[PDB]
Design an enzyme around this catalytic site. Structure first.
Site, PDB file in Angstrom:
ATOM      1  N   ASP A   1       0.817  -1.219   0.000  1.00  0.00           N
ATOM      2  CA  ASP A   1       0.000   0.000   0.000  1.00  0.00           C
ATOM      3  C   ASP A   1       0.847   1.264   0.000  1.00  0.00           C
ATOM      4  O   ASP A   1       1.325   1.694   1.055  1.00  0.00           O
ATOM      5  CB  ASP A   1      -0.899   0.037   1.234  1.00  0.00           C
ATOM      6  CG  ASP A   1      -1.853   1.229   1.226  1.00  0.00           C
ATOM      7  OD1 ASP A   1      -2.178   1.731   0.128  1.00  0.00           O
ATOM      8  OD2 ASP A   1      -2.275   1.664   2.316  1.00  0.00           O
TER       9      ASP A   1
ATOM     10  N   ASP B   1      -1.578   5.496  -5.296  1.00  0.00           N
ATOM     11  CA  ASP B   1      -1.936   4.632  -4.147  1.00  0.00           C
ATOM     12  C   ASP B   1      -2.252   3.186  -4.540  1.00  0.00           C
ATOM     13  O   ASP B   1      -3.354   2.886  -4.992  1.00  0.00           O
ATOM     14  CB  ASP B   1      -3.122   5.235  -3.383  1.00  0.00           C
ATOM     15  CG  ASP B   1      -3.597   4.355  -2.229  1.00  0.00           C
ATOM     16  OD1 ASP B   1      -2.860   3.434  -1.811  1.00  0.00           O
ATOM     17  OD2 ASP B   1      -4.714   4.597  -1.732  1.00  0.00           O
TER      18      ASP B   1
END
EC number: 3.4.23.46
Lengths: 8, 379
Positions: free
Chosen positions: B38, B222
């Protein structure tokens, strides 16, 4: 779906 | 003939729309766990107690090298949250760099809508900067520790291959993962991986919005977000334009809102009726930009459909945001993305593994001339 950082 | 970083190639796995994960080994003796990658956060955390959606979890009492930090920690996400306990322990990545580091680790003991039934991952690896770490920026993120403790160069790259696999190259770049040239955009500020979007086109047609709207109130890259998320005003104009471009076919209003799926008979999806989408990013030279272009193969995501079925169902994977633009997997699956932290920049090149067809491919092209790009950023 995924929804990764929030400002709460 | 194989590159220097060959042992890191194909070290990611996943299920579509459920994130991408890498194996990590923690504690002593070794406990190996699947960890979601992430770039949209900065905490390393792992399931550390039983949960209905976990097959395995971190057992701290079995690790002789575990050290309690005596401090609780809570992390809320766009959707989902967990609470746990801080500690440190030894961590290695089996299919990553040949080093072991002592890292901060949040042991997750309670969670809400975080873990996913049958996702195969058991924790999360936050790859962004200390500024957004919880409880505060004194909690050194994993990648910070890695660079501080070892020789590993301050850079990593991601190739996410949609349908699920891919590669996370740590400490470098593998040239078999992309074609054409790498184009770099500055990291505006080190918190999230924030970038500046200067123009948007749908099938070559400019959306014609003030660039300030594209970046209100930030734009980030992201890997832990499935969708391309756009500020409300941008989302509305984009949907309007995508609809106009695909008008040889009609879909219900709810499809564009992600509330309705549309399914085609297996192997008949009319990709050609949907337009391509281009984002222009600020380049490394004054008044210079470049553009990345994705296909419907990236922004229409299949929903399994795990067992063999006659129907290919899709969800529209561009959605609205109240917290700025998020370039999620929808964007990243078209490209090899280089997080060049050492030079404060992010590179994009066409991915060798991106899903496309015989008429169109994802693209990275430049240079273009764009004036007043500095004004685009939110202050």
């Amino acid at each position: 779906x995924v929804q990764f950082l929030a400002x709460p | 003939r194989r590159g220097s970083f060959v042992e890191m190639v194909d070290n990611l796995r996943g299920k579509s729309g459920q994130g991408y994960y890498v194996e990590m080994t923690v504690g002593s003796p070794p406990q190996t766990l699947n960890i979601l990658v992430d770039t949209g956060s900065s905490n390393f955390a792992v399931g550390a107690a039983p949960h209905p959606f976990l097959h395995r979890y971190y057992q701290r009492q079995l690790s002789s090298t575990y050290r309690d930090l005596r401090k609780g920690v809570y992390v809320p996400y766009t959707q989902g949250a967990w609470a746990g306990e801080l500690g440190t322990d030894l961590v290695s990545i089996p299919h990553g760099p040949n080093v072991t580091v002592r890292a901060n680790i949040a042991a997750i003991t309670e969670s809400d809508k975080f873990f996913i039934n049958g996702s195969n991952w058991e924790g999360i690896l936050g790859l962004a900067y200390a500024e957004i770490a919880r409880p505060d920026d004194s909690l050194e993120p994993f990648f910070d520790s890695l660079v501080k403790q070892t020789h590993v160069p301050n850079l990593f790259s991601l190739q996410l291959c949609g349908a699920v696999g891919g590669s996370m190259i740590i400490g470098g770049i593998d040239h078999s993962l992309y074609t054409g040239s790498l184009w770099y955009t500055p990291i505006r500020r080190e918190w999230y991986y924030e970038v500046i979007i200067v123009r948007v086109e749908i099938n070559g047609q400019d959306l014609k919005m003030d660039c300030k709207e594209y970046n209100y109130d930030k734009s980030i890259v992201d890997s832990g977000t499935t969708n391309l998320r756009l500020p409300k005003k941008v989302f509305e104009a984009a949907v309007k334009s995508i609809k106009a471009a695909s008008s040889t076919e009609k879909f219900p209003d709810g499809f564009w809102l992600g509330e309705q799926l549309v399914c085609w008979q297996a192997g008949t999806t009319p990709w050609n009726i949907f337009p391509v989408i281009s984002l222009y990013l600020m380049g490394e030279v004054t008044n210079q930009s470049f553009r990345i272009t994705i296909l419907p193969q990236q922004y229409l995501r299949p929903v399994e459909d795990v067992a063999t079925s006659q129907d290919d169902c899709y969800k529209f994977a561009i959605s609205q945001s109240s917290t700025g633009t998020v370039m999620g997997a929808v964007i990243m699956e078209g490209f090899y993305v280089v997080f060049d932290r050492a030079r404060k920049r992010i590179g994009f090149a066409v991915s060798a593994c991106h899903v496309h067809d015989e008429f169109r491919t994802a693209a990275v092209e430049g240079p273009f001339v764009t004036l007043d790009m500095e004004d685009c950023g939110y202050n």
